[PDB]
Amino acid sequence: ADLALGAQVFNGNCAACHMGGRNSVMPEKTLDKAALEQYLDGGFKVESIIYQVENGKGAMPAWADRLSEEEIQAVAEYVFKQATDAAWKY
Ligand code: HEC
Numbered sequence: 803a804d805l806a807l808g809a810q811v812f813n814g815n816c817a818a819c820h821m822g823g824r825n826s827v828m829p830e831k832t833l834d835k836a837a838l839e840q841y842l843d844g845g846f847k848v849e850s851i852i853y854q855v856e857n858g859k860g861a862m863p864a865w866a867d868r869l870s871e872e873e874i875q876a877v878a879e880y881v882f883k884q885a886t887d888a889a890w891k892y
Contacts, residue, residue, distance in 0.1 A: 804872070808880025811873045815865070816881075822892025823884060827861045835885040846885070851878040 812820075819826050823833035831841045843859070844850030855874050858864030865874060884890055 803879045804876045805880050805883060807873065808876035808878075808883075811869065811877040812880055815869070816877065819862075823890030824892050833881055833885060833890060835888065838885055846882075848875075848878050848882045851881055 820833055825831045825833070825837075831837060835846055838846040838851075842850050842854060844853065852874055854862070855869075855878055856864060856866045869877070
């Protein structure tokens with residue numbers, strides 16, 4: 803999908819906690835492929851990330867009220883793309 807929009811959305815909303823694909827609230831739950839396979843409900847799939855973005859999880863807020871449907875799909879695919887290619891620079 804729109805990967806340029808995904809970065810804009812990730813950069814303006816998610817980076818407060820996932821700077822560099824890291825996790826400042828919970829160090830272990832990072833945005834790396836292996837963290838995702840291990841800690842994200844549903845595993846490493848775009849769908850699992852979308853679900854977690856819209857409904858939140860614990861200290862992670864829900865985004866359904868703040869982002870649009872297309873923004874959620876974009877950010878999810880962007881995060882997916884980053885983990886696959888292991889492109890997170892921290
Ligand atoms: C800080 C207050 C956060 C913001 C802003 C966003 N996320 Fe987050 N995320 C945060 C926590 C503490 C956690 C784990 C919560 C738990 O109880 O398990 C997460 C987790 C994720 C994950 C899964 C990570 C993993 O299991 O290894 C994803 C895929 C995720 N977060 C994505 C993400 C995106 C795209 C955001 C912007 C829309 C976003 N998070 C904001 C804390 C915070």
